[PDB]
Design an enzyme around this catalytic site. Structure first.
Site, PDB file in Angstrom:
ATOM      1  N   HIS A  45      11.776   3.414   0.812  1.00  0.00           N
ATOM      2  CA  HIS A  45      12.401   2.343   1.336  1.00  0.00           C
ATOM      3  C   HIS A  45      12.172   1.643   0.788  1.00  0.00           C
ATOM      4  O   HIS A  45      12.638   0.321   0.898  1.00  0.00           O
ATOM      5  CB  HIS A  45      12.742   2.757   2.559  1.00  0.00           C
ATOM      6  CG  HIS A  45      12.095   2.574   3.719  1.00  0.00           C
ATOM      7  ND1 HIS A  45      10.811   2.767   3.916  1.00  0.00           N
ATOM      8  CD2 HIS A  45      11.217   1.155   3.826  1.00  0.00           C
ATOM      9  CE1 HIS A  45       9.709   2.505   4.066  1.00  0.00           C
ATOM     10  NE2 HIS A  45       9.844   1.297   4.632  1.00  0.00           N
ATOM     11  N   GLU A  59      -6.709  -5.810  -4.177  1.00  0.00           N
ATOM     12  CA  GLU A  59      -6.269  -7.038  -2.923  1.00  0.00           C
ATOM     13  C   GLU A  59      -7.482  -7.038  -1.664  1.00  0.00           C
ATOM     14  O   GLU A  59      -7.578  -6.656  -1.553  1.00  0.00           O
ATOM     15  CB  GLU A  59      -5.468  -7.697  -2.874  1.00  0.00           C
ATOM     16  CG  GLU A  59      -4.510  -8.211  -1.816  1.00  0.00           C
ATOM     17  CD  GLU A  59      -5.157  -9.571  -2.853  1.00  0.00           C
ATOM     18  OE1 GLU A  59      -5.826 -10.252  -2.562  1.00  0.00           O
ATOM     19  OE2 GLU A  59      -4.929 -10.165  -2.913  1.00  0.00           O
ATOM     20  N   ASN A  61      -7.171 -10.268   1.015  1.00  0.00           N
ATOM     21  CA  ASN A  61      -6.747 -11.773   0.873  1.00  0.00           C
ATOM     22  C   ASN A  61      -5.705 -11.823   0.367  1.00  0.00           C
ATOM     23  O   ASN A  61      -5.861 -12.335  -0.488  1.00  0.00           O
ATOM     24  CB  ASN A  61      -7.802 -12.962   1.437  1.00  0.00           C
ATOM     25  CG  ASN A  61      -7.356 -14.278   2.065  1.00  0.00           C
ATOM     26  OD1 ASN A  61      -5.878 -14.189   1.749  1.00  0.00           O
ATOM     27  ND2 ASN A  61      -8.023 -14.747   2.767  1.00  0.00           N
ATOM     28  N   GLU A  69      -9.328  -9.292  -8.086  1.00  0.00           N
ATOM     29  CA  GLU A  69      -7.748  -8.748  -7.985  1.00  0.00           C
ATOM     30  C   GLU A  69      -7.616  -8.121  -9.146  1.00  0.00           C
ATOM     31  O   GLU A  69      -7.518  -8.677 -10.789  1.00  0.00           O
ATOM     32  CB  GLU A  69      -6.779  -9.852  -7.413  1.00  0.00           C
ATOM     33  CG  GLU A  69      -6.957  -9.935  -5.918  1.00  0.00           C
ATOM     34  CD  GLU A  69      -7.989 -11.466  -5.720  1.00  0.00           C
ATOM     35  OE1 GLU A  69      -8.784 -11.567  -7.182  1.00  0.00           O
ATOM     36  OE2 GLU A  69      -7.415 -12.407  -5.026  1.00  0.00           O
ATOM     37  N   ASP A  93      11.280  10.015   2.699  1.00  0.00           N
ATOM     38  CA  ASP A  93      11.141   8.503   1.589  1.00  0.00           C
ATOM     39  C   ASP A  93       9.327   8.243   0.976  1.00  0.00           C
ATOM     40  O   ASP A  93       8.595   7.709   1.410  1.00  0.00           O
ATOM     41  CB  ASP A  93      10.637   7.973   3.368  1.00  0.00           C
ATOM     42  CG  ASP A  93      10.789   5.609   3.248  1.00  0.00           C
ATOM     43  OD1 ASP A  93      11.014   5.536   1.520  1.00  0.00           O
ATOM     44  OD2 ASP A  93       9.815   5.528   4.048  1.00  0.00           O
ATOM     45  N   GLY A 186       5.975  -4.057   6.337  1.00  0.00           N
ATOM     46  CA  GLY A 186       4.838  -4.769   5.349  1.00  0.00           C
ATOM     47  C   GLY A 186       4.174  -3.655   5.648  1.00  0.00           C
ATOM     48  O   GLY A 186       3.118  -3.614   4.728  1.00  0.00           O
ATOM     49  N   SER A 188       4.232  -0.749   5.631  1.00  0.00           N
ATOM     50  CA  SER A 188       5.724   0.322   4.655  1.00  0.00           C
ATOM     51  C   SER A 188       4.847   0.376   3.196  1.00  0.00           C
ATOM     52  O   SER A 188       4.879  -0.397   2.762  1.00  0.00           O
ATOM     53  CB  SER A 188       6.874  -0.140   4.999  1.00  0.00           C
ATOM     54  OG  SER A 188       7.190  -0.245   6.383  1.00  0.00           O
ATOM     55  N   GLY A 189       4.860   1.815   3.069  1.00  0.00           N
ATOM     56  CA  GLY A 189       4.583   1.720   2.005  1.00  0.00           C
ATOM     57  C   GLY A 189       3.283   2.189   2.007  1.00  0.00           C
ATOM     58  O   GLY A 189       2.338   3.365   0.870  1.00  0.00           O
TER      59      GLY A 189
HETATM   60 CA   LIG Z   1      -6.467 -12.405  -3.016  1.00  0.00          CA
END
Ligand SMILES: [Ca+2]
Ligand SMILES: O=[Se](=O)([O-])[O-]
Length: 240
Positions: A45, A59, A61, A69, A93, A186, A188-189
């Site tokens: 989704h 990542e 922040n 990153e 899903d 957010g 999600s996944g």
């Molecule tokens: Ca960052």
């Protein structure tokens, strides 16, 4: 995640942030798990919309430079062939994202360990959900990666009338439901990490929560059960 605590800097090195382009900026929309240097596992989704997506590994922040990153484009999106956006309760899903370039593995970027096919967690198994999702129902994304302890709720209990009933399938993992802590939009996944023989493995891909809210008593967060999809995952990687 609601009722979580900030994760230690990159203590979950396989967690990625899936972001989409908004005008000239990028917005986080979902989590995912790096499973190969050039493959990410997320929820189907999360990619229903035909947006421009990028994956950020290492990542911590979302709105500040962490110095760790790596940013990479999504070259191909392979959604489970049975996913139906009109029926998240039917399951399937899950989607695999082939990255434009292989990312570099280091202290902050590592592959997530997946469970052996068919593995089912005993009720009340220790797991942690991680993500930058909403910190309150209808709230806002977290700036720093959050984690919440969400013990599993087995199928028998989770599919009972006071819980999720028939909405949950055996192809899913339920976790939490204490009314205080949970996944939220957010997240999600993203992963549900659970301890298995001294190893944290990613047993779930965050899929859904109650329409009444994220942290709802007896409505544990529901995840796609990764172990039901090992063959599919291997077949996708093998034919791409
Ligand atoms: Ca960052
Ligand atoms: O045994 Se399984 O993981 O439902 O195929």
């Amino acid at each position: 995640v609601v009722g979580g605590t900030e994760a230690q800097r990159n203590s979950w090195p396989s967690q990625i942030s899936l972001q989409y382009r908004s005008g000239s900026s990028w917005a986080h929309t979902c989590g995912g798990t790096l499973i190969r240097q050039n493959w990410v596992m997320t929820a189907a989704h999360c990619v229903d919309r035909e947006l421009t997506f990028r994956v950020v590994v290492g990542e911590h922040n979302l709105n500040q430079n962490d110095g760790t990153e790596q940013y990479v484009g999504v070259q191909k999106i392979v959604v489970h062939p049975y996913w139906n956006t009109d029926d998240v309760a039917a399951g399937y899903d899950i989607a695999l994202l082939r990255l434009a370039q292989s990312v570099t593995l280091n202290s902050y970027v590592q592959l997530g360990v997946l469970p052996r096919a068919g593995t089912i967690l005993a009720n009340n198994s220790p797991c942690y959900i991680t993500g930058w999702g909403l910190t309150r129902t209808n709230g806002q994304l977290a700036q720093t990666l959050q984690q919440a302890y969400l013990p599993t709720v087995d199928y028998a209990i989770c599919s009972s009338s006071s819980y999720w009933g028939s909405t949950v399938k055996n192809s899913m993992v339920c976790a939490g439901g204490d009314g205080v802590r949970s996944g939220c939009q957010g997240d999600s996944g993203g992963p549900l990490h659970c301890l298995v023989n001294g190893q944290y493995a990613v047993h779930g891909v965050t899929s859904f929560v109650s329409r009444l809210g994220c942290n709802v008593t007896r409505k544990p967060t529901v995840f796609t059960r990764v172990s039901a999809y090992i063959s599919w995952i291997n077949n996708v990687i093998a034919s791409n």
